[PDB]
Amino acid sequence: GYVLGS
């Protein structure tokens, strides 16, 4: 899985 945040 993956997580991106900004």
Side-chain angles (χ1 to χ4, degrees):
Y2 54 83
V3 175
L4 300 91
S6 183

